[PDB]
Write a protein that binds this ligand. Structure first.
Ligand SMILES: CCN1CCN[C@H]1c1cccc(-c2ccccn2)n1
Ligand SMILES: CCN1CCN[C@H]1c1cccc(-c2ccccn2)n1
Lengths: 201, 199, 198, 199, 200, 200, 199, 200, 201, 201
């Protein structure tokens, strides 16, 4: 009916710890990094310090409601929802979340979470100061949910800060499948390739 | 009644997670930054470290009470209130809040919140050392509410005399953008901090 | 009562959100700093980084018990008490509290809170390497309680001898700040630390 | 049963404070470190700054369920499980967990927890600049559970970042134990020998 | 009882806010710091950064159980327990607690708590490069409880990293009892003297 | 959605004190009484003691779920439901509910509630002992909701016990609207006229 | 604000244990009985069993709201409300409430509560078979609140059952203020005289 | 696992509102009345007052546990358990439960519940003073769950009945039956208890 | 303080299960039955049905407050207080409490509970139609607290009784009884209430 | 420790649902009925209406406390203790509890629960008006706990019986007995209580 009713129900009945699997189909999560800033780099030790909006999308039908004559969408705290347990496998610091931890929810149950994160990665930074630029690959996927429970897909400069000493040449994202020695099941991930270089003046 | 009553009511009934949209009008949010100190500036990196009191105001009519023979206003923990999900879109460090997270509530339901924040920005440091100075732009709007739910409206006595820097000018302009994709319009306040290194 | 009873009472009924305003009188808070240590000072940037005990004191009658055959005071976690929402007006860093967050409550409802706080300020660092020394002023007052709600009044020997600086003098004085936007005055204590490098 | 049911059962009944000893025989924990990155090294101070994944396995029958027409495993927040109070004996910073604080629970009540941790150790960094390399020993055991209550055992390179300034010669992992003359009791540890060198 | 029952009991009935004074006698606390590492010394600023296990011990009879067919000892989170409010009166950083915040409660009501703490101190670091070394005094006490409510007492190197830049010559720990200028009462305290030096 | 899921969502949401009004329209409550037995009649006081199944119905849309691959209705404690505050205006004993207090909830949010009630009324019993027989009128409406808020409406001896001493000739149920002096708003009630006689 | 909000505010801040004394003065409670039935009379025992509507009315300002775009009234459970602690001083069984225990709150704070009660009294049944009839006095008053805290007032047959064997010749309601020897406080009651006879 | 833990888990995971349906098949409830006494009988009004033990038996897999070194069964208050919403169709007074409202849970999820009920009923008392006695049929079945959600059964088509009664029991037959009403598609399953008894 | 703060403080800190003993000195309970009606007597069976106000009075200084600029008294549900565990040893029905279960709490912590009770007793009804009347004896005291825990005392301090009863009250006297049995080192007390009544003419 | 702390400890860690079984030995429960009055008797229907005190004692170790400088006993509402689920097999009315529902607890975990109950039974009232009298047997045992879990034993087999009953008691014996049933393969234990009574003059 109203904003307050919609948020009450989601709070009271939403099960944060419960992956919203559908008929035991993997939950499909969309992920696209939108880089905003490159804040520090190190060709010697091979580290980068980035700021990026982690465009993260997925469906949770248990959230959906009868719009009809009611709010299009709502803003929900992420404590009040299930959220994918995503990790950047090659981060070497923990996500500084820069933004209000609110996710935007539509009446169908499709969810949009997009926090600004500042994080430090460990990646190939050789060629940063050349014209070829460097290509730093960030791998992201489910920390605890494997192929049959979570799958991850990428999607279809307008963001990047003009005051950065760096400039992006190209950013590309590939779905991937890894396996581990311990474990018979495979995990999926988005491989994000940031090609960037130091500016000329 | 009295304070304890007025504060019990707010705590028992306030719903932090519910924007108080009054009849499907947008919650008007008045914003005004007051810089207190500038601390680290880098014309190479175009990064800055600043401290400012973000003077914020809006109306949550649910909070209202009958002023007749009772407190004009009370102080309240912002965990007991709805608060707009403001974010600085060029911030490169999380906001570090320096002061007690309390806000003031007037009997008419006007909420008045003024945190002291320290945060780092990616902005134009070009010219800080010259006469006409640097102009650093800081953009502040709601992180999840487009212009039908929240609408942000911008409203030296505050700046430390002991700063290494000096403030030529601060100006505030609203900013609205529609896109091909999405029928909702988005708003931010644009804060132009024109400052320079003292003699 | 015993210590358990008295704490339980304070836990159940201390309205930790409610200024213990008496009639409509400002709650009269006393603040008096004692410096333990000056740790890093910048004359260029006008930034000092200091450690100090904030002696705070105020009365809350919802706390009091008849010290009849009872303890005359107890230790109360500040989560379970009303505390003045104080702030350093010229702090450039969030207070680092170095101590257990406990306050002493007297049977008459007198509270004595004294945290050890490490924090950096903007203030006049100049003259630090001179005999007459630098004079760094800190202001501490309520963040939200104007002057009809919370008054503030001010009341070397704890100062570390291993410091690189020394305190020539420390005066503390009643002050109020007002702003053109806002109808109300806010009381503080203006602490003048006169000190110099060794 | 389904994910939501199992999760609720685990949250309602799993007792995070209660070591799941069986027939008072010590709780068998496996700790197996996978080094991801070596980031800083100081041959003067004998300190390393390391990133590893800590494969921690044990067993808690009270989490178990009938997997007849149910999930093989589910994912549970460690706050809703008893976890081993493991601690690095020679650690010089707080463990910085970089990953979702979530563990995997098998229906037979076996728990699979692999946090990704950054932390500094005081250890032997000598020879790092050389072909045979330094050997940094890292010691991990229960902080409060002596060897009648917990044993730690190793499980009876490949993830290390190829963009590290360092590489790995050998990793060996051996059960050991320790006492302190203040106190009667002994504590099992796994001793992780990291044989590495600069590239 | 079993661990399950003993822990449920404590979680249900322990008052972490209530000092376990018995018959208006003070709580005897054994405190004894054991240094593991010395991470950073500055002879200019007079500062050390150190890591210590702070072996802490005291009696809280309300915790006791009859140990007949029962555990002799259990691992309780300290949030379930009253804990002495110990400070280090010349710390310049907050105590960085590095290990799981659990304590040991013996069936007779004895609480054994040993955190590993990283913390920075303001002390005399002159003569660390000498041979008889620097002597860094640290003052440990209750913040809010006087000697009538807490007495703090020490205990009579096996722990210090052999790979430290530095080495410990001696560590001694004596009782001190102190009276401030403001207030009538005394606070019992410990003095810890870290006599140590560089290696070469 | 399973029954487990739906029941959770109802218990947790759903506000038993919140009349399910739509667009400030009256909530339409249907009520058909089904007499099961007449256990006492008295022509002198004019009193009967009856048992009846009170077939009750109304929509509450905050209860609805999409029953795509899911159950069509569920059984729900009325303590977790709003229910109409119906009263017998001419009752002289309190309703003695004989049955489990569970109502049925269809996925379109229709509530089907039907308790077995025993209760005693003040009504015209004259000539229960003749062919044409007594006609005992029972008025039922909401105790606190007027017509704009609630409309109690009727619907249109498959229930009645073959071993009673009485037999039902007729039951008719007609809409009734009533205005009390105190209060200018009007209640919307149902007159149940029970036409029965002794069998002999 | 819709009903569902008003009812939520009431439940969370209605302090049903607290008498809404406004300022100094007592709470003014209107009580007026409406007899529906007389059911069993015993002139030997001086006993009567009676069904009556207890129209009750008072002001709790704490329930108040602004109806501009709001209902004027909602129905509230008395569990979530302060109710006057009324007792019929000459009752000899407990009140059997025959109706839902819901009261009615006006936006200006007035409450209207009107239960149908069956209850037996001790009173003057003599002459119930004569022309002039019997006059049963029923004395209703606060059980714990004396006259400084509660004053009762009536407000100047019509729902009586024609199918009763008795008939009301008259009903009159006056106020009375009674003091007992133990206790220096005066209590108020309404005394309702029920002039009825057998038809 | 002990009694204490088993009961904690049940308490803590209790969904009393969730019919424990397994893969959309109906929950099979057994009902057997074991008559203890007959307190009052009326051939005029066709009413009897009776005390019986109602043995009831169903599965609820959600309560189960591993019974290796664990109790075989435990005692659980019914407010923690889902219970069949059972009801007599011809009852004329509330069921007066005389015993502790406790059932027994077995390790496999079986729930055995047996309350003592005193209740009045409307039935065929004709012939109570004859050689072949009266045959009062009592009909018991779920009030709100139909054929597809609950199915009943008698496990029982001299050890219980009071030797001191004014009546003897000749026979009690219990048969699965069913009941539908024109209003409502779904059939309801019931147990048909024929109490054939006489005055001595 | 206002009434609202006092009731909040009582509700929040009150221990109904806890006898307010002061240093293991016993809680002094005053009792006084003021009879209102006598409703049924039976000389064959020695049974009476009666209604009385049972005035109870005790101290619980843990409920005190500062009367300074406050109310001297407030009403409190008894379900938030400790109450005397009083039983009538010769009752044959359970006590029907006819009145609101509220009590008065005075600012010195004095509690004043007076319920109107209706109960049937097994007592000496003989002589009821004579001029000396019957004397029916009712014994009242704690069910589980011996006399080092609760001391019951009659206040003995007609005005209350129905002018419409068939019966009339000739005198009421109340006296303390106390007994030591050999099993237990403890004396038990009771208050013996002697209702001397006769039928009216 | 004081009463407030013993009661608190009991309230919080008692486990009212959990039978205090030790070493899978039966819990030994001791019921002795003490008769206060006989109120109705009916020779036609074989029914009596009686009032009695149900003396019930057992041991529950989870209640115990060290009673040095402590109360040795406290009074505890039965909601906060495990209580045996006793019932009168041959009862025909609900138990009417006439007394405060408190139980007395000894620091060693010994419990006395003694409600005055009024109830009605089906029993042999034959011979009530003869000099030999009727022998009404009442059976009281655990509803749901068979013999391997609850064992039931009387103590001893006047001072209680009202002098004003129409009736008089001749003897009360009380005897261990065990009833078993077709359906269910465990035996229950009971105190069979033989009331031998008759009418007075
Ligand atoms: C006038 C600014 N202040 C002086 C001291 N306290 C602050 C304060 C406290 C609470 C609210 C506000 C404020 C001011 C303007 C707009 C919004 N809030 N300031
Ligand atoms: C007299 C109006 N009503 C019609 C049916 N219900 C009643 C009603 C309900 C709720 C409150 C009141 C009321 C209360 C005080 C005074 C008058 N009426 N009446």
């Amino acid at each position: 009916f109203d904003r307050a009713d919609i948020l009450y129900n989601i709070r009271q009945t939403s099960r944060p710890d419960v992956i919203p699997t559908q008929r035991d189909r993997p939950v499909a999560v969309s992920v696209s990094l939108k880089f905003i800033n490159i804040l520090e780099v190190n060709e010697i030790t091979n580290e980068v310090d980035v700021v990026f909006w982690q465009q993260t999308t997925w469906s949770d039908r248990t959230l959906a409601w009868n719009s009809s004559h009611s709010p299009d969408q709502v803003s929900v705290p992420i404590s009040s929802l299930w959220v994918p347990d995503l990790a950047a496998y090659n981060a070497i610091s923990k996500p500084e979340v820069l933004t209000p931890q609110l996710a935007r929810v539509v009446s169908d149950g499709e969810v949009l979470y997009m926090p600004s994160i500042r994080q430090r990665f460990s990646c190939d930074v050789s060629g940063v100061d050349t014209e070829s630029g460097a290509t730093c690959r960030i791998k992201i996927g489910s920390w605890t949910h494997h192929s049959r429970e979570i799958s991850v897909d990428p999607t279809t400069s307008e963001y990047f800060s003009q005051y950065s000493r760096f400039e992006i040449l190209d950013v590309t994202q590939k779905k991937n499948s890894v396996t581990y020695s311990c474990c018979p099941e495979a995990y999926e991930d988005v491989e994000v390739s940031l090609n960037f270089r130091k500016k000329g003046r």
